[PDB]
Design an enzyme around this catalytic site. Structure first.
Site, mmCIF file in Angstrom:
data_model
loop_
_atom_site.group_PDB
_atom_site.id
_atom_site.type_symbol
_atom_site.label_atom_id
_atom_site.label_comp_id
_atom_site.label_asym_id
_atom_site.label_seq_id
_atom_site.Cartn_x
_atom_site.Cartn_y
_atom_site.Cartn_z
ATOM 1 N N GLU A 83 35.146 47.703 27.122
ATOM 2 C CA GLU A 83 34.279 46.601 26.706
ATOM 3 C C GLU A 83 34.854 45.955 25.445
ATOM 4 O O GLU A 83 35.219 46.651 24.498
ATOM 5 C CB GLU A 83 32.860 47.097 26.414
ATOM 6 N N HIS B 164 47.869 45.956 27.672
ATOM 7 C CA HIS B 164 47.169 44.856 28.319
ATOM 8 C C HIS B 164 45.845 45.288 28.937
ATOM 9 O O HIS B 164 45.056 44.453 29.374
ATOM 10 C CB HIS B 164 48.068 44.172 29.366
ATOM 11 N N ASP C 249 53.972 46.498 25.825
ATOM 12 C CA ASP C 249 52.686 46.697 26.483
ATOM 13 C C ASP C 249 52.225 48.156 26.583
ATOM 14 O O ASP C 249 51.559 48.546 27.542
ATOM 15 C CB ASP C 249 52.704 46.057 27.869
ATOM 16 N N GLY D 82 43.873 48.719 38.073
ATOM 17 C CA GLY D 82 43.272 50.021 37.886
ATOM 18 C C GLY D 82 44.353 51.027 37.578
ATOM 19 O O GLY D 82 44.239 51.804 36.644
ATOM 20 N N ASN D 83 45.419 50.998 38.363
ATOM 21 C CA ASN D 83 46.542 51.891 38.140
ATOM 22 C C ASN D 83 47.216 51.658 36.791
ATOM 23 O O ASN D 83 48.083 52.430 36.382
ATOM 24 C CB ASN D 83 47.571 51.730 39.258
ATOM 25 N N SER D 84 46.818 50.589 36.109
ATOM 26 C CA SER D 84 47.461 50.179 34.866
ATOM 27 C C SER D 84 47.276 51.221 33.778
ATOM 28 O O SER D 84 46.161 51.481 33.339
ATOM 29 C CB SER D 84 46.925 48.820 34.399
ATOM 30 N N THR E 285 52.733 49.918 35.113
ATOM 31 C CA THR E 285 52.400 48.791 34.256
ATOM 32 C C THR E 285 51.849 47.642 35.075
ATOM 33 O O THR E 285 50.650 47.354 35.044
ATOM 34 C CB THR E 285 53.624 48.282 33.491
ATOM 35 N N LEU F 19 54.347 43.326 41.461
ATOM 36 C CA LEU F 19 54.547 41.963 41.916
ATOM 37 C C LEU F 19 53.627 41.724 43.096
ATOM 38 O O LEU F 19 53.513 42.583 43.977
ATOM 39 C CB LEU F 19 55.992 41.726 42.338
ATOM 40 N N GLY G 85 70.976 42.979 15.101
ATOM 41 C CA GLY G 85 71.281 41.643 14.634
ATOM 42 C C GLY G 85 72.367 40.991 15.465
ATOM 43 O O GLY G 85 73.449 40.680 14.963
ATOM 44 N N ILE G 86 72.089 40.797 16.749
ATOM 45 C CA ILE G 86 73.026 40.095 17.611
ATOM 46 C C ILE G 86 72.326 39.203 18.623
ATOM 47 O O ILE G 86 71.122 39.322 18.865
ATOM 48 C CB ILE G 86 73.998 41.056 18.354
ATOM 49 N N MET G 87 73.107 38.292 19.189
ATOM 50 C CA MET G 87 72.665 37.428 20.261
ATOM 51 C C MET G 87 73.597 37.621 21.433
ATOM 52 O O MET G 87 74.753 37.998 21.254
ATOM 53 C CB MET G 87 72.677 35.972 19.799
HETATM 54 P P1 LIG Z 1 46.901 47.368 36.220
HETATM 55 O O1 LIG Z 1 46.064 48.452 36.719
HETATM 56 O O2 LIG Z 1 48.168 47.227 37.277
HETATM 57 C C1 LIG Z 1 48.982 46.077 37.324
HETATM 58 C C2 LIG Z 1 49.273 45.605 38.746
HETATM 59 C C3 LIG Z 1 48.585 44.955 36.387
HETATM 60 O O3 LIG Z 1 46.016 45.969 36.296
HETATM 61 C C4 LIG Z 1 45.011 45.659 35.346
HETATM 62 C C5 LIG Z 1 44.076 46.816 34.924
HETATM 63 C C6 LIG Z 1 45.481 44.749 34.202
#
Ligand SMILES: *P(=O)(OC(C)C)OC(C)C
Ligand SMILES: *P(=O)(OC(C)C)OC(C)C
Ligand SMILES: *P(=O)(OC(C)C)OC(C)C
Lengths: 392, 392, 392
Positions: C22, C49, C79, C152-154, C170, C173, C210-212
């Protein structure tokens, strides 16, 4: 102590490529996946539908290398397409397996460049075999898998655990293009044929038996009082066709091909359309509840391929194909408002030479086209005459 | 040298069918998948939701055979539906396993006719157990898998590696009907019960304990000072109910059933709604931090099933069910503008015979209905009288 | 006699949680999944996230228990987000494995609370490694799997068969948020670093060389005459940077890091951005076709994190971070129409105390904030002075 595939992948993945495409018909860019077949020649394969109408095609390797490739034969009927690599060096072919001795419950892995995601391997099993019917008119006898497949995997590989090839990721089923867990691939065996064919002719020489038929379902087996719920039903043989000569009657059913039981007509079609004219084979019938064995041989037909676009790149007009032996390329049929003919082109003609370079077949041709003459000197021959046509 | 399932599939697949449906409520056509249970009887099963309101249902085999089947009992509460085959010959039943001794990490394979795709097998594992809640009012205690499932797989099978059954593909979760890798199936054990029930009664005899409750989450265990974050909370026992008699107090929690730990209330519900009246069982409580063991027995209730549509096919009107022993069929409740009653039908009546053919139960009835009398002679009885009703 | 994972799951699953959230920025509710890291401390992890801008966060266990948790450090660049549990009792940490010694063909399983579905495990393999590029600006070096993943798996887990952790689910796709069979997770190793960092600083101390540079593809290797189709190309070193001092020239390419071959620049970035300032390391170059080995050490930079919102919960305004040693919190930059400043807040200030409670770092701060003073007494210091600011 941990079962894995990585071991074998190490060995196989290399034999696979990410295919990037540019063409026109408006300019376009696409991508798919290909598989090395002959390590030395640099023979890659792919769904025709991935390379169709391709102007420039580059191939990227498992190890970062970029090569240029060239068309070598398309067969949009079964959607395969052999291409070759310019200056093949230090390559990795792949071993093929017998798609025929496959079983439903075996595991399979599929690799490919889906969504341009570089070497992407996924896993599954043989969901089922001999599936067909998406585009009824195509020669389809797909193997079906739950392995994960998408746009990109097209022309990708699909192998048994041993890292032996068994089929090519062609298409998947999906509303809203997305993998539901149903993918399809063309059995190795099929491909081998279509392959080694173009390998030696730059095209496909379609054999037919000369018959008509339709899927024998249960209801039918009832009506025609036979024991067989699956199979190919012989509607009507053709006269002076292999079948005719062979001695086959309308109302017969085929149960096997070269010992290989037959799931259904669809397969049988794809199976043989696959094979090259003159290919010998043996069949198991069943007319009037009585089994039959017969031998045969594919004959000629009346098919269509290789256009004045698939070789000219832009010059629409007549269809084109080889002629007799290495006797040059024959113009099949010039349209009406077509630019090729608006160069002096007319059907029946028989290109014999160009730019002081003899031509015996489409190969020697697209080969001169590769040198890209600014000015194009055709040495054709209408009737008993000898003339030239030009271009820029 | 290659681990595979095909070996066992050879043996199991046969025990599965592709179900094709025609019905009305407007004419419709659908399809699902079914599983042979009793090889001799020809007892197939399926999600009720696949066969609901079915006029004509045909079954197709793994080996091409087509059979005609008939309704034998529907339970749209847990969505199972036993059907039988007309003239079962040379069939293949299937061995069942104990859905109870399942574990989350085990592998599973699911087969079915998805999208009318003939025998389609896919692979996965037990994603999780005792999942519920989609339609809270249904008896659901699904097993959850990542195996691939879709429209068609409904009533399909889902087995351990040994080719032993453990549950039935019911529904999947999916926005835009498509497999995301989340499928659900009804545990074997549950099904067995619902099954052998209809096997002998053409319907379901629902036992209840007579209690109310709700999911014991953590917060609750706080408020009510107990040690148990999962379980079934006893809101309020009923008087003269099994629970009452058994000696259970409002504010108790159940931790186990017949030794089987209890994930949550939802399951407990489905678990027992599953079972037949009089079924004995043993429970583990925990009132005031103190464990309890008690025995019990399901009693009657006040449920609903089998309509004047599920048997008449078109003749809406009163609900209908068996009566006493084999004492015929009783009209539950005639509506108002309902055609059945517009035949002289009125609640309370008690069909005892028809066409000089005694009737003791819905079976003997739908059986006469099968002969499809053009004219329909009902031998019912209002109050102490004896009359007849008619039809066409 | 049946290969399974359940055995190990028994042991591992516990070490995973369903995260419920929340917050506000309008009130919101979300959910994800987390993983126990330190059994005693109660150190769970998750995609930033999933927890970003979180007011109240509760954690639910594999076994039903609900706990309250608190923020302990966010790094929305890669993230990740460490959180801790209030009153950790009888927990289950998890063993980590070396994401580096991973191979493409290995199998993996992912668990998580997808769609609020409680402990949901799914299966797959390593689709591919070192994938990046979704949000180019983030430090991404994902592992890619065909295992099934969703909302949910996030923050969920993803483990080798041994029940050892290797990465965190994370993102996936998917057009139309749905698993196509492509999931991504952050390699263990990476996470470990980002982790033990916050563990001791409540934040991330970003080291840079410190590089590009930019991805060395094939074309480039051509233009710059080197042998390497993959790698990191050194655009332009910086002066007085680790690289500078180390002795690296613009136009060099890196092939390995600490012995670990380098797929591409993207990875290299994520790899080191991961690491803490002063972290020593060894590199393999290749200037002018000649291999090179050099040592180095991350230095400071000029990054951004922890806002006056991530700690105040509502009090927008200046950014904030630690200062010198345990010398209190420094206000980075007050905006214009920002409420923090509308409390007397101005950049450059240096909060040293509050409510007669010394403050040495963000920790001691959010700690007082936890007591939730109705009235807020700031003991800051502009220039050489000493003042107080207030709040409610
Ligand atoms: P995540 O559980 O999994 C990714 C596909 C984003 O998704 C939410 C909770 C941001
Ligand atoms: P292919 O990679 O795979 C099929 C699902 C079509 O798709 C494109 C490249 C045509
Ligand atoms: P079923 O085959 O599977 C579920 C996803 C519903 O679907 C139809 C036939 C109702």
């Amino acid at each position: 102590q941990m079962p894995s595939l990585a071991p074998m992948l190490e060995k196989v993945m290399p034999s696979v490529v990410s295919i990037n495409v540019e063409g026109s018909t408006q300019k376009f860019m696409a991508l798919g996946s290909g598989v090395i077949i002959d390590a030395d020649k640099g023979y890659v394969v792919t769904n025709n539908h991935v390379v169709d109408n391709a102007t420039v095609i580059k191939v990227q390797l498992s190890d970062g290398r970029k090569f240029d490739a060239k068309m070598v034969g398309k067969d949009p009927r079964s959607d395969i397409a052999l291409i070759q690599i310019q200056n093949p060096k230090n390559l990795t072919a792949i071993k093929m397996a017998d798609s025929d001795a496959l079983r439903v419950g075996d595991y399979t892995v599929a690799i490919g460049n889906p969504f341009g995601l570089g070497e992407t391997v996924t896993s599954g099993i043989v969901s089922a075999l001999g599936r067909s019917g998406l585009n009824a008119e195509n020669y389809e006898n797909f193997i079906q898998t739950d392995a994960a497949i998408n746009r990109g995997n097209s022309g990708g590989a699909l192998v048994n655990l041993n890292g032996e090839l068994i089929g090519i990721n062609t298409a998947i089923l999906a509303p809203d293009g997305g993998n539901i867990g149903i993918g399809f691939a063309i059995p190795s065996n099929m491909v081998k044929n279509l392959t080694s064919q173009m390998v030696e002719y730059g095209q496909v020489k379609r054999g037919e038996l000369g018959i008509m038929g339709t899927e024998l379902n249960s209801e039918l087996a009832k009506a025609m009082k036979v024991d067989a719920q699956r199979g190919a039903f012989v509607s009507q043989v053709l006269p002076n066709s292999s079948a005719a000569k062979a001695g086959i009657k309308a109302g017969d059913v085929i149960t096997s091909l070269n010992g290989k039981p037959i799931s259904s007509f669809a397969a049988l079609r794809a199976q043989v359309g696959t094979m090259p004219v003159g290919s010998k084979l043996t069949l198991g019938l069943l007319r009037d509840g009585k089994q039959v064995n017969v031998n045969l041989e594919l004959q000629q037909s009346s098919q269509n391929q290789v256009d004045s676009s698939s070789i000219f790149n832009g010059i629409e007009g007549a269809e084109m194909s080889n002629k007799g032996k290495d006797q040059g390329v024959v113009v099949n049929n010039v349209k009406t408002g077509t630019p090729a003919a608006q160069i002096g082109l007319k059907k029946g003609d028989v290109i014999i030479g160009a730019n002081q370079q003899a031509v015996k077949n489409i190969a020697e041709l697209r080969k001169v086209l590769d040198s890209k003459p600014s000015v194009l000197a055709l040495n054709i021959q209408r009737g008993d005459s000898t003339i030239y046509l030009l271009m820029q």
